[PDB]
Amino acid sequence: FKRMKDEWTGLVEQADPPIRAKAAEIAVAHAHYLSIEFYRIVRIDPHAEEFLSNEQVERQLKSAMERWIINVLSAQVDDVERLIQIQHTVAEVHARIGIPVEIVEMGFRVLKKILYPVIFSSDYSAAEKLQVYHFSINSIDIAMEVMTRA
Amino acid sequence: KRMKDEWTGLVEQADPPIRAKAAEIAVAHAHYLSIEFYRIVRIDPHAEEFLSNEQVERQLKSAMERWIINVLSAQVDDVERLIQIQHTVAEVHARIGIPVEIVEMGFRVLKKILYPVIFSSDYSAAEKLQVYHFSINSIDIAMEVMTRA
Numbered sequence: 233f234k235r236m237k238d239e240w241t242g243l244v245e246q247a248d249p250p251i252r253a254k255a256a257e258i259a260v261a262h263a264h265y266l267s268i269e270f271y272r273i274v275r276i277d278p279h280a281e282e283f284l285s286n287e288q289v290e291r292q293l294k295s296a297m298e299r300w301i302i303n304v305l306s307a308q309v310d311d312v313e314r315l316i317q318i319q320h321t322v323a324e325v326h327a328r329i330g331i332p333v334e335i336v337e338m339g340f341r342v343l344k345k346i347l348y349p350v351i352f353s354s355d356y357s358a359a360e361k362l363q364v365y366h367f368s369i370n371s372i373d374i375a376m377e378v379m380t381r382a
Numbered sequence: 383k384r385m386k387d388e389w390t391g392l393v394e395q396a397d398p399p400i401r402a403k404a405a406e407i408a409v410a411h412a413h414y415l416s417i418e419f420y421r422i423v424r425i426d427p428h429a430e431e432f433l434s435n436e437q438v439e440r441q442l443k444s445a446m447e448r449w450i451i452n453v454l455s456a457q458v459d460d461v462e463r464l465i466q467i468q469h470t471v472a473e474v475h476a477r478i479g480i481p482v483e484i485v486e487m488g489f490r491v492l493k494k495i496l497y498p499v500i501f502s503s504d505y506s507a508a509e510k511l512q513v514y515h516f517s518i519n520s521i522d523i524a525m526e527v528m529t530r531a
């Protein structure tokens with residue numbers, strides 16, 4: 233945990249404050265789309281659709297996915313410890329139900345894929361898009377590692 | 383089967399000069415990326431136990447260099463061959479007894495250390511964005527194929 237906290241903290245610190253601000257801006261403005269786009273693409277997969285069947289979970293997961301994206305992409309130094317606890321909780325939920333790891337990680341790949349066009353279509357410069365995308369990818373990756381290994 | 387189409391589509395939808403620059407970045411810095419991969423990875427105790435002796439080090443570094451170049455210089459015809467590689471690597475990791483969460487940790491390190499190399503290149507910011515995008519997606523799809531194999 234100590235090593236994970238330091239790395240995630242370092243990721244936020246080494247990320248330029250205007251870049252983290254723009255990443256947070258991208259998150260808040262498009263988290264709703266990213267969540268609903270995530271859900272349908274995932275459910276296309278037969279192995280994944282069996283877990284995303286009912287309407288109640290849909291409304292719950294979309295809201296939770298939206299909150300998750302906002303928390304991770306708008307992460308500050310103070311939020312690092314809390315974010316780690318969140319990934320543990322999510323890991324418990326996925327384990328409680330019995331959702332395979334390779335299916336969840338496929339979702340992370342889906343999430344990272346649909347995030348890029350949103351950043352690419354943003355009003356920012358090419359250099360800023362690169363740094364926002366870099367911070368976003370590393371943040372999602374470290375979050376995935378914490379969730380998986382928990 | 384779907385993995386082939388997605389990896390093929392990834393190469394097709396990627397601009398040829400971008401993939402060329404990504405391939406050039408690979409060839410020029412794969413040697414550094416491999417050694418940088420080793421140092422960061424061995425920090426983790428669970429991973430270090432597999433990377434103890436010097437002989438294993440040299441092979442993984444050599445294999446990492448070839449892997450990075452092959453994946454980033456991927457053409458459409460190479461896609462099927464690349465998938466076969468991931469199966470072979472997965473068998474090796476299984477033969478040794480390397481945990482899945484440990485291998486994926488290596489992928490994160492690889493994607494992490496790749497960014498400064500692309501960032502410090504002589505290309506434009508726009509080209510760097512697309513090269514980095516193609517590189518990340520290529521490594522991600524390769525990881526999923528390797529993991530499920």
Ligand code: HEM
Nearest residue numbers: 274280283289292293296297300321322325335336339340
């Ligand atoms: C194929 C991939 C995935 C599937 C099928 C899946 C499925 C589920 C299901 C069925 C639940 C239970 C929700 C409920 O009972 O109301 C859940 C919870 C949750 N998942 Fe996933 N999940 C996937 C990947 C992900 C990813 C990639 C993330 C974040 C990046 C994520 C974040 C969450 C969160 C935040 C919750 C709710 C946590 C809470 O309520 O405390 N999931 N997931």
Ligand code: HEM
Nearest residue numbers: 423429432438441442445446449470471474484485488489
């Ligand atoms: C912590 C992460 C990892 C560890 C500790 C690890 C360890 C190893 C070891 C000990 C070998 C065999 C070396 C030998 O027999 O001399 C090996 C094989 C190999 N690994 Fe990994 N590995 C990791 C992750 C990865 C990743 C992320 C990649 C690629 C992105 C990769 C690609 C390969 C390749 C291409 C080979 C050799 C394939 C062949 O001989 O045909 N490994 N790994």
